[PDB]
mmCIF file of C-alpha atoms in Angstrom:
data_model
loop_
_atom_site.group_PDB
_atom_site.id
_atom_site.type_symbol
_atom_site.label_atom_id
_atom_site.label_comp_id
_atom_site.label_asym_id
_atom_site.label_seq_id
_atom_site.Cartn_x
_atom_site.Cartn_y
_atom_site.Cartn_z
ATOM 1 C CA UNK A 1 0.000 0.000 0.000
ATOM 2 C CA UNK A 2 2.729 2.501 1.083
ATOM 3 C CA UNK A 3 4.688 2.587 -2.228
ATOM 4 C CA UNK A 4 2.524 0.912 -4.941
ATOM 5 C CA UNK A 5 4.868 -1.823 -6.289
ATOM 6 C CA UNK A 6 8.015 -3.708 -5.106
ATOM 7 C CA UNK A 7 7.766 -7.197 -6.750
ATOM 8 C CA UNK A 8 10.505 -9.048 -4.680
ATOM 9 C CA UNK A 9 8.329 -11.681 -2.968
ATOM 10 C CA UNK A 10 10.880 -11.671 -0.088
ATOM 11 C CA UNK A 11 10.745 -14.993 1.815
ATOM 12 C CA UNK A 12 8.044 -15.450 4.461
ATOM 13 C CA UNK A 13 9.211 -18.296 6.770
ATOM 14 C CA UNK A 14 6.657 -21.085 6.338
ATOM 15 C CA UNK A 15 8.804 -24.191 6.924
ATOM 16 C CA UNK A 16 9.993 -23.151 10.403
ATOM 17 C CA UNK A 17 7.046 -25.019 11.964
ATOM 18 C CA UNK A 18 4.534 -27.611 10.811
ATOM 19 C CA UNK A 19 1.586 -25.466 11.947
ATOM 20 C CA UNK A 20 2.535 -22.628 9.615
ATOM 21 C CA UNK A 21 3.506 -25.112 6.900
ATOM 22 C CA UNK A 22 0.113 -26.835 6.780
ATOM 23 C CA UNK A 23 -1.702 -23.476 6.987
ATOM 24 C CA UNK A 24 0.445 -22.045 4.160
ATOM 25 C CA UNK A 25 -2.369 -21.884 1.604
ATOM 26 C CA UNK A 26 -4.867 -20.317 4.010
ATOM 27 C CA UNK A 27 -2.401 -17.786 5.433
ATOM 28 C CA UNK A 28 -0.893 -16.488 2.192
ATOM 29 C CA UNK A 29 -2.080 -15.552 -1.262
ATOM 30 C CA UNK A 30 -5.418 -13.943 -2.054
ATOM 31 C CA UNK A 31 -6.998 -14.806 1.293
ATOM 32 C CA UNK A 32 -8.026 -13.278 4.619
ATOM 33 C CA UNK A 33 -7.110 -14.040 8.223
ATOM 34 C CA UNK A 34 -8.526 -13.026 11.594
ATOM 35 C CA UNK A 35 -7.268 -13.382 15.147
ATOM 36 C CA UNK A 36 -9.586 -13.531 18.181
ATOM 37 C CA UNK A 37 -7.900 -13.359 21.593
ATOM 38 C CA UNK A 38 -9.650 -14.000 24.907
ATOM 39 C CA UNK A 39 -9.041 -11.914 28.043
ATOM 40 C CA UNK A 40 -9.728 -12.795 31.693
ATOM 41 C CA UNK A 41 -11.040 -9.920 33.886
ATOM 42 C CA UNK A 42 -9.830 -11.287 37.237
ATOM 43 C CA UNK A 43 -7.115 -9.305 39.003
ATOM 44 C CA UNK A 44 -5.331 -12.453 40.225
ATOM 45 C CA UNK A 45 -4.471 -13.489 36.641
ATOM 46 C CA UNK A 46 -3.133 -10.006 35.822
ATOM 47 C CA UNK A 47 0.261 -10.942 34.368
ATOM 48 C CA UNK A 48 -1.265 -13.632 32.157
ATOM 49 C CA UNK A 49 -3.771 -11.119 30.800
ATOM 50 C CA UNK A 50 -0.892 -8.744 30.106
ATOM 51 C CA UNK A 51 0.878 -11.558 28.259
ATOM 52 C CA UNK A 52 -2.179 -12.049 26.060
ATOM 53 C CA UNK A 53 -2.146 -8.326 25.311
ATOM 54 C CA UNK A 54 1.515 -8.597 24.323
ATOM 55 C CA UNK A 55 0.493 -11.425 22.005
ATOM 56 C CA UNK A 56 -2.520 -9.407 20.832
ATOM 57 C CA UNK A 57 -0.239 -6.444 20.073
ATOM 58 C CA UNK A 58 1.285 -8.550 17.267
ATOM 59 C CA UNK A 59 0.159 -8.661 13.619
ATOM 60 C CA UNK A 60 0.659 -4.865 13.293
ATOM 61 C CA UNK A 61 2.095 -3.267 16.455
ATOM 62 C CA UNK A 62 0.168 -0.012 15.957
ATOM 63 C CA UNK A 63 0.781 3.094 18.068
ATOM 64 C CA UNK A 64 -1.668 3.463 20.961
ATOM 65 C CA UNK A 65 -0.190 6.853 21.995
ATOM 66 C CA UNK A 66 -0.350 8.254 25.525
ATOM 67 C CA UNK A 67 -3.443 7.487 27.621
ATOM 68 C CA UNK A 68 -4.251 9.802 30.537
ATOM 69 C CA UNK A 69 -7.189 11.867 31.808
ATOM 70 C CA UNK A 70 -6.990 15.128 33.728
ATOM 71 C CA UNK A 71 -8.680 15.243 37.124
ATOM 72 C CA UNK A 72 -12.366 16.110 36.839
ATOM 73 C CA UNK A 73 -12.070 18.714 39.600
ATOM 74 C CA UNK A 74 -9.019 20.193 37.872
ATOM 75 C CA UNK A 75 -10.910 20.032 34.570
ATOM 76 C CA UNK A 76 -13.734 22.041 36.139
ATOM 77 C CA UNK A 77 -11.229 24.508 37.621
ATOM 78 C CA UNK A 78 -9.564 24.994 34.229
ATOM 79 C CA UNK A 79 -12.888 25.430 32.428
ATOM 80 C CA UNK A 80 -14.172 27.872 35.055
ATOM 81 C CA UNK A 81 -10.972 29.934 34.949
ATOM 82 C CA UNK A 82 -11.085 30.085 31.146
ATOM 83 C CA UNK A 83 -14.768 31.060 31.233
ATOM 84 C CA UNK A 84 -14.115 33.776 33.828
ATOM 85 C CA UNK A 85 -11.263 35.145 31.715
ATOM 86 C CA UNK A 86 -13.409 35.133 28.562
ATOM 87 C CA UNK A 87 -16.397 36.824 30.210
ATOM 88 C CA UNK A 88 -14.182 39.411 31.924
ATOM 89 C CA UNK A 89 -12.456 40.171 28.617
ATOM 90 C CA UNK A 90 -15.831 40.567 26.899
ATOM 91 C CA UNK A 91 -17.109 42.916 29.611
ATOM 92 C CA UNK A 92 -13.935 45.025 29.604
ATOM 93 C CA UNK A 93 -13.903 45.233 25.797
ATOM 94 C CA UNK A 94 -17.572 46.270 25.738
ATOM 95 C CA UNK A 95 -16.964 48.775 28.557
ATOM 96 C CA UNK A 96 -19.464 47.195 30.982
ATOM 97 C CA UNK A 97 -16.807 45.933 33.432
ATOM 98 C CA UNK B 1 0.890 51.363 64.562
ATOM 99 C CA UNK B 2 2.535 54.109 66.717
ATOM 100 C CA UNK B 3 4.315 55.157 63.532
ATOM 101 C CA UNK B 4 2.588 53.442 60.547
ATOM 102 C CA UNK B 5 4.928 50.639 59.188
ATOM 103 C CA UNK B 6 8.618 49.585 58.021
ATOM 104 C CA UNK B 7 8.498 45.728 58.149
ATOM 105 C CA UNK B 8 10.798 44.081 60.764
ATOM 106 C CA UNK B 9 8.384 41.741 62.648
ATOM 107 C CA UNK B 10 11.268 40.859 65.043
ATOM 108 C CA UNK B 11 10.555 37.586 66.944
ATOM 109 C CA UNK B 12 8.495 36.745 70.088
ATOM 110 C CA UNK B 13 10.063 33.929 72.217
ATOM 111 C CA UNK B 14 7.249 31.338 71.774
ATOM 112 C CA UNK B 15 9.550 28.306 72.162
ATOM 113 C CA UNK B 16 10.826 29.415 75.589
ATOM 114 C CA UNK B 17 7.950 27.539 77.264
ATOM 115 C CA UNK B 18 5.477 24.851 76.255
ATOM 116 C CA UNK B 19 2.578 27.047 77.418
ATOM 117 C CA UNK B 20 3.280 29.817 74.913
ATOM 118 C CA UNK B 21 4.285 27.319 72.216
ATOM 119 C CA UNK B 22 0.993 25.402 72.345
ATOM 120 C CA UNK B 23 -0.980 28.674 72.429
ATOM 121 C CA UNK B 24 0.937 30.210 69.496
ATOM 122 C CA UNK B 25 -2.126 30.640 67.279
ATOM 123 C CA UNK B 26 -4.332 31.826 70.165
ATOM 124 C CA UNK B 27 -2.006 34.622 71.369
ATOM 125 C CA UNK B 28 -1.615 35.890 67.768
ATOM 126 C CA UNK B 29 -2.569 35.157 64.155
ATOM 127 C CA UNK B 30 -5.724 33.183 63.363
ATOM 128 C CA UNK B 31 -7.889 33.600 66.462
ATOM 129 C CA UNK B 32 -10.033 36.060 68.443
ATOM 130 C CA UNK B 33 -8.904 36.101 72.069
ATOM 131 C CA UNK B 34 -10.237 37.435 75.368
ATOM 132 C CA UNK B 35 -8.256 37.937 78.568
ATOM 133 C CA UNK B 36 -10.023 37.772 81.934
ATOM 134 C CA UNK B 37 -8.071 39.086 84.931
ATOM 135 C CA UNK B 38 -8.837 38.350 88.588
ATOM 136 C CA UNK B 39 -8.033 40.895 91.318
ATOM 137 C CA UNK B 40 -7.555 40.274 95.032
ATOM 138 C CA UNK B 41 -9.036 43.350 96.782
ATOM 139 C CA UNK B 42 -6.769 43.174 99.841
ATOM 140 C CA UNK B 43 -4.075 45.790 100.363
ATOM 141 C CA UNK B 44 -1.435 43.107 100.995
ATOM 142 C CA UNK B 45 -1.630 41.926 97.367
ATOM 143 C CA UNK B 46 -1.489 45.496 96.008
ATOM 144 C CA UNK B 47 1.820 45.254 94.136
ATOM 145 C CA UNK B 48 0.855 41.922 92.582
ATOM 146 C CA UNK B 49 -2.532 43.340 91.607
ATOM 147 C CA UNK B 50 -0.856 46.347 90.004
ATOM 148 C CA UNK B 51 1.426 44.040 88.027
ATOM 149 C CA UNK B 52 -1.563 42.074 86.747
ATOM 150 C CA UNK B 53 -3.344 45.260 85.728
ATOM 151 C CA UNK B 54 -0.204 46.512 84.011
ATOM 152 C CA UNK B 55 0.135 43.355 81.945
ATOM 153 C CA UNK B 56 -3.630 43.384 81.446
ATOM 154 C CA UNK B 57 -3.268 46.823 79.880
ATOM 155 C CA UNK B 58 -0.681 45.473 77.444
ATOM 156 C CA UNK B 59 -3.079 42.666 76.531
ATOM 157 C CA UNK B 60 -5.380 45.300 75.020
ATOM 158 C CA UNK B 61 -2.824 46.351 72.380
ATOM 159 C CA UNK B 62 -2.514 42.895 70.722
ATOM 160 C CA UNK B 63 -4.067 42.548 67.234
ATOM 161 C CA UNK B 64 -5.047 39.205 65.696
ATOM 162 C CA UNK B 65 -5.334 38.263 62.016
ATOM 163 C CA UNK B 66 -8.548 36.270 62.266
ATOM 164 C CA UNK B 67 -9.889 34.276 59.313
ATOM 165 C CA UNK B 68 -12.988 32.103 59.199
ATOM 166 C CA UNK B 69 -11.557 28.974 57.454
ATOM 167 C CA UNK B 70 -14.069 27.531 54.928
ATOM 168 C CA UNK B 71 -12.401 24.993 52.571
ATOM 169 C CA UNK B 72 -10.419 26.480 49.670
ATOM 170 C CA UNK B 73 -10.456 23.085 47.927
ATOM 171 C CA UNK B 74 -14.202 23.651 47.420
ATOM 172 C CA UNK B 75 -14.508 27.378 48.166
ATOM 173 C CA UNK B 76 -12.291 28.162 45.177
ATOM 174 C CA UNK B 77 -14.728 26.168 43.030
ATOM 175 C CA UNK B 78 -17.706 27.931 44.617
ATOM 176 C CA UNK B 79 -16.098 31.355 44.152
ATOM 177 C CA UNK B 80 -15.293 30.650 40.503
ATOM 178 C CA UNK B 81 -18.862 29.466 39.884
ATOM 179 C CA UNK B 82 -20.253 32.568 41.608
ATOM 180 C CA UNK B 83 -17.957 34.768 39.513
ATOM 181 C CA UNK B 84 -19.194 33.012 36.365
ATOM 182 C CA UNK B 85 -22.786 33.589 37.488
ATOM 183 C CA UNK B 86 -22.122 37.276 38.208
ATOM 184 C CA UNK B 87 -20.421 37.860 34.855
ATOM 185 C CA UNK B 88 -23.172 35.967 33.009
ATOM 186 C CA UNK B 89 -25.872 38.009 34.749
ATOM 187 C CA UNK B 90 -24.085 41.276 33.967
ATOM 188 C CA UNK B 91 -23.622 40.311 30.313
ATOM 189 C CA UNK B 92 -27.214 39.149 29.790
ATOM 190 C CA UNK B 93 -28.736 42.085 31.685
ATOM 191 C CA UNK B 94 -26.732 44.544 29.561
ATOM 192 C CA UNK B 95 -27.477 42.610 26.358
ATOM 193 C CA UNK B 96 -23.836 41.667 25.729
ATOM 194 C CA UNK B 97 -24.161 37.878 25.982
#
């Protein structure tokens, strides 16, 4: 997709294991493949669940980026301060403050 | 006060005794304080009585920086919301918003 042509079939290792060897026709060529991974919600199994995620991260390894949420109280403080600044600026510009 | 100001708050020996140390905030700062003095009417105690009255007089000159308390963690939020309400009311009443 990136370029548009490259030809060189490379060499996808199929003979390294019998599982991938027998599934050669299904995996490659004009075909489609899907991967469904199961997750356990229990805390006690935490590491194992993480391991599944590390195995579920495969087949692309896309970028999940940073994940974080500001505190809701701090969010309200920030929004209120911005609103106060905006309304004060409007009043001062219009001469009513 | 005698003059008006010039900084230099000096230092009152509060650590010299546990009594004054524990009562640091009550003698000065965030509190309203009342002194009650007891007098023995007999002549024999006269000097002692005078001393009490003298120190009692000095107790009148002390000024305290009393504050209520509230809770800034929530009173800041309340004050910002009230400011937003005031600015909104001013803008809508004057036809600016």
